[PDB]
Design a protein around this nucleic acid. Structure first.
Length: 135
RNA sequence: GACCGCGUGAGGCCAUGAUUAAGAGGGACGGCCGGGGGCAUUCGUAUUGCGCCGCUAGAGGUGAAAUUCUUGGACCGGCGCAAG
């Protein structure tokens, strides 16, 4: 099923890769970003909570996303990386690189790659305290 | 104002009398310069909340966890609003 597309033509979804230090999201939408095609989360594929954000868990999430997209006809993806952002960290998580590689290795093609991490033009105060999270 | 003379007057006379303008200071003036100050105004994302839509079973959190939040739809995505 899906869209009735020609031989050489490809169709684009947008893949939102949200990669925090606790968990990894491999959400795939349409081009408008409104219609979810498939969302598989990195903590859907493991048992321990410590392995939610491991790169092996983001790989398994990335494989079961592309398998779901190609049986809806989606051929290529624009990539949107995303860290936590805001007051929190701006570097994307450990499963950011391994999901993007595994998405490429499973017969899925790549459009643009962008960064849509929330960046405060300012910020409310962070959740640490003044002396700030000592351990 | 000293000084001499002369009728409270009319005089002479003094080279007649005011150091300088501080690499002290105050003040004027000139074109500037500055996250200085006060009042008003404008803007920016973000966060939180909220509506509505989409798909879902986990989300979150940590050294590891649990309290917590979720099929009544959480989290993630999209549009919109609100407030500080």
């Amino acid at each position: 099923l899906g869209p009735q597309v020609a031989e050489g033509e490809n169709v684009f979804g947008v893949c939102h890769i949200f990669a925090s230090f606790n968990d990894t999201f491999v959400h795939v939408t349409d081009l408008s970003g409104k219609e979810t095609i498939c969302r598989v989360t990195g903590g859907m594929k493991v048992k321990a909570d410590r392995d939610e954000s491991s790169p092996y868990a983001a790989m398994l999430a990335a494989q079961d996303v592309a398998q779901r997209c190609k049986e809806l006809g989606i051929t290529a993806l624009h990539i949107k990386l995303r860290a936590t952002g805001g007051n929190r960290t701006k570097t994307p998580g450990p499963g950011a690189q391994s999901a993007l590689r595994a998405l490429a290795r499973s017969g899925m093609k790549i459009g643009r790659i962008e960064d849509v991490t929330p960046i405060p033009s300012x910020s409310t105060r962070r959740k640490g305290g003044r002396r700030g999270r000592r351990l």
